[PDB]
Design a protein around this motif. Structure first.
Motif, mmCIF file in Angstrom:
data_model
loop_
_atom_site.group_PDB
_atom_site.id
_atom_site.type_symbol
_atom_site.label_atom_id
_atom_site.label_comp_id
_atom_site.label_asym_id
_atom_site.label_seq_id
_atom_site.Cartn_x
_atom_site.Cartn_y
_atom_site.Cartn_z
ATOM 1 N N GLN A 1 0.808 -1.215 0.000
ATOM 2 C CA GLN A 1 0.000 0.000 0.000
ATOM 3 C C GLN A 1 0.843 1.269 0.000
ATOM 4 N N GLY A 2 2.128 1.173 0.351
ATOM 5 C CA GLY A 2 2.969 2.358 0.365
ATOM 6 C C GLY A 2 3.163 2.963 -1.013
ATOM 7 N N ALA A 3 3.382 2.120 -2.017
ATOM 8 C CA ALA A 3 3.610 2.597 -3.371
ATOM 9 C C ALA A 3 2.286 2.887 -4.073
ATOM 10 N N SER A 4 2.389 3.472 -5.263
ATOM 11 C CA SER A 4 1.217 3.765 -6.075
ATOM 12 C C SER A 4 0.776 2.512 -6.814
ATOM 13 N N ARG A 5 -0.528 2.256 -6.814
ATOM 14 C CA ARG A 5 -1.100 1.075 -7.440
ATOM 15 C C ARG A 5 -2.058 1.489 -8.546
ATOM 16 N N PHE A 6 -2.070 0.715 -9.628
ATOM 17 C CA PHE A 6 -2.921 0.997 -10.768
ATOM 18 C C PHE A 6 -3.774 -0.221 -11.087
ATOM 19 N N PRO A 7 -5.026 -0.022 -11.493
ATOM 20 C CA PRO A 7 -5.889 -1.167 -11.795
ATOM 21 C C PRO A 7 -5.305 -2.027 -12.904
ATOM 22 N N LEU A 8 -5.443 -3.340 -12.744
ATOM 23 C CA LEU A 8 -4.886 -4.300 -13.682
ATOM 24 C C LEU A 8 -5.914 -5.383 -13.957
ATOM 25 N N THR A 9 -6.173 -5.639 -15.234
ATOM 26 C CA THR A 9 -7.068 -6.711 -15.661
ATOM 27 C C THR A 9 -6.192 -7.876 -16.099
ATOM 28 N N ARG A 10 -6.047 -8.863 -15.224
ATOM 29 C CA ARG A 10 -5.135 -9.966 -15.471
ATOM 30 C C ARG A 10 -5.714 -10.944 -16.480
ATOM 31 N N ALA A 11 -4.822 -11.602 -17.211
ATOM 32 C CA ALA A 11 -5.234 -12.683 -18.089
ATOM 33 C C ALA A 11 -5.736 -13.852 -17.257
ATOM 34 N N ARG A 12 -6.773 -14.521 -17.751
ATOM 35 C CA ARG A 12 -7.330 -15.646 -17.018
ATOM 36 C C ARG A 12 -6.301 -16.759 -16.898
ATOM 37 N N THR A 13 -6.188 -17.316 -15.697
ATOM 38 C CA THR A 13 -5.279 -18.414 -15.420
ATOM 39 C C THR A 13 -6.050 -19.552 -14.775
ATOM 40 N N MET A 14 -5.679 -20.778 -15.126
ATOM 41 C CA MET A 14 -6.224 -21.976 -14.508
ATOM 42 C C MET A 14 -5.145 -22.647 -13.675
ATOM 43 N N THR A 15 -5.457 -22.914 -12.412
ATOM 44 C CA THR A 15 -4.550 -23.673 -11.567
ATOM 45 C C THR A 15 -4.464 -25.105 -12.073
ATOM 46 N N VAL A 16 -3.241 -25.585 -12.289
ATOM 47 C CA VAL A 16 -3.009 -26.945 -12.752
ATOM 48 C C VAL A 16 -1.889 -27.556 -11.925
ATOM 49 N N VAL A 17 -1.869 -28.882 -11.890
ATOM 50 C CA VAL A 17 -0.826 -29.625 -11.194
ATOM 51 C C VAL A 17 0.271 -29.944 -12.197
ATOM 52 N N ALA A 18 1.474 -29.450 -11.937
ATOM 53 C CA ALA A 18 2.598 -29.610 -12.845
ATOM 54 C C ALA A 18 3.749 -30.298 -12.133
ATOM 55 N N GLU A 19 4.372 -31.248 -12.824
ATOM 56 C CA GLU A 19 5.578 -31.909 -12.333
ATOM 57 C C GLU A 19 6.776 -31.127 -12.853
ATOM 58 N N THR A 20 7.314 -30.242 -12.018
ATOM 59 C CA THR A 20 8.473 -29.457 -12.412
ATOM 60 C C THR A 20 9.728 -30.328 -12.390
ATOM 61 N N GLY A 21 10.875 -29.695 -12.642
ATOM 62 C CA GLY A 21 12.135 -30.418 -12.643
ATOM 63 C C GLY A 21 12.509 -31.006 -11.300
ATOM 64 N N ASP A 22 11.890 -30.527 -10.218
ATOM 65 C CA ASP A 22 12.175 -31.061 -8.892
ATOM 66 C C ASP A 22 11.613 -32.462 -8.698
ATOM 67 N N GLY A 23 10.702 -32.899 -9.566
ATOM 68 C CA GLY A 23 10.100 -34.207 -9.466
ATOM 69 C C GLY A 23 8.837 -34.265 -8.634
ATOM 70 N N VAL A 24 8.579 -33.253 -7.814
ATOM 71 C CA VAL A 24 7.355 -33.190 -7.032
ATOM 72 C C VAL A 24 6.282 -32.493 -7.857
ATOM 73 N N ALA A 25 5.029 -32.754 -7.508
ATOM 74 C CA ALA A 25 3.887 -32.173 -8.196
ATOM 75 C C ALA A 25 3.288 -31.070 -7.339
#
Lengths: 74, 332, 329, 331
Positions: free
Chosen positions: B33-57
DNA sequence: ACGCACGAAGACCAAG
DNA sequence: GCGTCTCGAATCTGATGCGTAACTTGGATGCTTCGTGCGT
């Protein structure tokens, strides 16, 4: 009860699309023009029963070994 | 039948995610809240389960395009480019209710609640168009299983499989675009520019005085709003490859041909919002029909697709407004 | 005979929970009355007790697919893929009672209640399909006891067990998908777009005028327009699930039918969301009494060869008269 | 309806990117805090996926002019060179709200929640100007789809296609310009120079001593003076750009208006740097649905005659009533 | 002749 | 088939506004009997 009872809902229905297709292809011998979800063979039904997490405890007079053996297969 | 369509976006794809978000000038979402904030319309995102390089999901957000948006894109292509040309060629007129049912599934917000006759269900589900989408006042089950638009990404490997790994992109594929609006009366600099304005200099002075008073009042209070605006919206970067999966529940050859025609004329459409900025432009790279590739440089073609195209041509020739009118009609 | 089916969902799984739930644009479930509320159709959840940060275990909602849904999914897979085609090959015809008994276990064929002799019970409870799913006028007990679809999650370790700790997810596995409906008439832009409409521009003008009047009347204060904005909760894609199927005393035919359905199970969906392609999945492991019987090409191997031969023989000798007798019609 | 425009910038293009970035004296962007950190205004870039020649997709920054900037450039060109001169011939005067709506899409930040009637939509979407640029209190959808200005680069071949490969440039196309602001009084060092200042030498001495006191106070501390040293980042001069303008089902008058704007587009600058003459460009080619319609004297030819005739007739029949109806709020 | 089909009808309190 | 000295120093090292708006804000269905005709 280890937790509050949960009202579990279940239904029952015959897919009218598949029934109509089977009626068209002759698999099903039905002359009725339309299904009746309120009652009949194609009735949708809504019923509920409660689900509980519980530890069942009961007292009885009998043989420990045989009661435990019977309850092993439960 | 399973149709997998490979899509590359020429222009950035912007699908607005509902909800208020804020970003700072630096580019930090929901800033302190200290800095100046501007309205942002984010691109739609879907939460998904991904197996990254760490091997965990782990659950990760993935920028996608909704399956409902893609379904409506397919339906609008089908109607505006295949069905409606045939109806107008045969001089077939739909009622307003039939039109709204073809374009939105139902002619109102109140379903009938009365069952359909079996022969009516068989007739509609064999229709080239109403069979795929269904709906109507008697809410019918369509044949079209249409999925979202998942970018070929490291995060979508568990979903779309590993047969498109060569097109995978590792890092973030999302970018933030800043947008401005200006008060036109503030760019007047000569009496010539204000000559077209009725009243002219007096009107411009009144507008500027009102703007100054409103700005001072808003600064002090910290009810009309001015034309000065600075906000941002978040888009998926251009050039990323997407996988689109379309499934159809045991279709006739007419319905497959209709879907193929829509795919042939789909690149002329645009995936999501952003009309002013020419967002959503794309090009189809490969269309896979039940595990086989049926896409040519011209478009969906080949010997394997001849039966579908002939069947849909016959269905279009025999298509009339009677089926739409009967489907859209309400029992009560 | 235990069957352990490990399932990974390609697309989100949407098992609509009954009830009217509301959400705000920020994602807050059941917001206070101050802010605008949008209807929400949550995913099905079962209250389970889980060790949340050790300490004392508390009840948490676990998103699942109900056991009845998957019982019916197995039944539909069997019928659509290995039973109905088999009956069509014989040109078999099913009456309404037999069809209802086969597809929903309904008793409308003969609701008076029919007495089943012991020989009849032996004959019919050994039926490759009808033995597994009982019901009908006889209301025979089926040999099948399927479980719900429990995700491999931190909160389901007391149901699933610790055998699949490697495939467990720690965070929440649900999300809210927002859906919108548009009035097509509000999106006409020229008489070319209104040509296909019978009234042309006049019909669109009347539609828009009535929409405006209704909206103004509702704002000041029947019929509902097409415009709508709502949301529904789905279980995110990629989460792994464990499905348990059990049979009390199976014949070879019934186990073979189960394995055939498992081979053909991935062609179907789980729960709802057919329009949005919800419920797509891939079988990752089928375990038959502790041994893995799943290959890349489906359930195969020498350990399951007897069941397939037995079910093939039962299908070849399958007649509609067995269904009619089971339905007592 | 697809228009491709090939644009080469005569002067550097400066589309500033919002945000405070910092540059050291040797050209390193966001340097370590130990060194000097003169502020930098960066040219706007949009991340794009590009093949670096090895067959692997990479997200790289590409300096562009935003699509909104070019869309407003087109709108302003149309209004200033075609629409207003047509209105001036008939002495038709727009209201202040109508003028604001024409030049920015609205007269206020509060839209009306009602949808416009179908008659109004048909009337406006067929208008030569308001049909192209939607807006107004009722959110009309325009027919114009203005894209960003993409330099023909190695990093934009995945976007603009391979139709223009001989105009591609491999290296970086962005450069840093160092800007300085002097204090006039410090350069003032003659009694004649201060003869024009009220108070003469006393005022200049007060100014210099106050500056010295403020500088000493600020340095000891660890209102702002005039002296400055900054940097702004510009795209180099001579790069070719591809501008893609798409229109869905346009009338002849609207295409004519667009081509008229493109004829007189070079008279206006693209973005930023008005003081330093930035944004100047020349059009190399205009492609009209796969056909090149650019002549040395502008967009000319029999293929474009009907568009120009239609827009000329529409302008001769152009009256302010459409603008006033468009800008009038429904509540 | 007999079984199936189709519509009218009748119980009705009523919340947070 | 030659090299040292030299081989910098001191500033500057941003400033201002904008920093959302309107709608949407769910819908429907889960009964069985009785009487009267109508298909096998």
């Amino acid at each position: 009860k280890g937790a509050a009872s949960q009202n579990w809902m279940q239904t029952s229905r015959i897919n009218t699309a598949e029934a109509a297709r089977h009626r068209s292809e002759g698999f099903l011998l039905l002359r009725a023009a339309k299904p009746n979800p309120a009652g009949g063979p194609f009735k949708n039904s809504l019923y509920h029963y409660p689900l509980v997490w519980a530890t069942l405890t009961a007292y009885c007079v009998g043989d420990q070994a045989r009661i435990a053996d019977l309850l092993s297969q439960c | 039948m399973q149709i997998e369509v490979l899509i590359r976006n020429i222009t950035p794809i912007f699908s607005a995610a509902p909800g208020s978000y804020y970003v700072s000038l630096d580019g930090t979402i929901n800033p302190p809240q200290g800095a100046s904030r501007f309205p942002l319309t984010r691109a739609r995102t879907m939460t998904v389960v991904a197996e990254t390089g760490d091997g965990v999901a782990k659950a990760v957000p993935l920028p996608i395009v909704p399956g409902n948006t893609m379904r409506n894109l397919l339906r609008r292509t089908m109607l505006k480019d295949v069905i409606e040309p045939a109806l107008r060629d045969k001089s077939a007129q739909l009622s307003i209710g039939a039109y709204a049912t073809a374009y939105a599934g139902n002619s109102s917000g109140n379903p009938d609640g009365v069952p359909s006759s079996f022969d009516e269900i068989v007739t509609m589900r064999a229709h080239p168009f109403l069979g795929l989408f269904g709906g109507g006042p008697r809410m019918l089950q369509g044949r079209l299983m249409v999925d979202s638009l998942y970018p070929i990404h490291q995060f979508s490997q568990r979903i779309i499989g590993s047969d498109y790994i060569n097109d995978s992109i590792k890092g973030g594929i999302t970018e933030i675009v800043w947008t401005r609006r200006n008060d036109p009366i503030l760019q007047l600099g000569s009496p010539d520019d204000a000559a077209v304005i009725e009243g002219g200099a007096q009107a411009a002075n009144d507008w500027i005085t009102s703007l100054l008073a409103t700005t001072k009042a808003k600064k002090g209070k910290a009810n009309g709003r001015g034309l000065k605006a600075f906000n941002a919206h978040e888009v998926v970067i251009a050039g990323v490859k997407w996988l689109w999966r379309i499934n159809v529940d045991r279709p006739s050859e007419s319905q497959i041909g209709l879907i193929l025609l829509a795919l042939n004329k789909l690149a002329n459409q645009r995936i999501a919002g952003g009309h002013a900025k020419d967002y959503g432009r794309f090009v189809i790279e490969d269309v896979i029909l039940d595990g086989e590739s049926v896409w040519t440089p011209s478009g969906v073609s080949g010997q394997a697709t001849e039966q579908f195209f002939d069947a849909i041509a016959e269905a279009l020739d025999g298509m009339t407004s009677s089926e739409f009118e009967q489907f859209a009609a309400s029992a009560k």
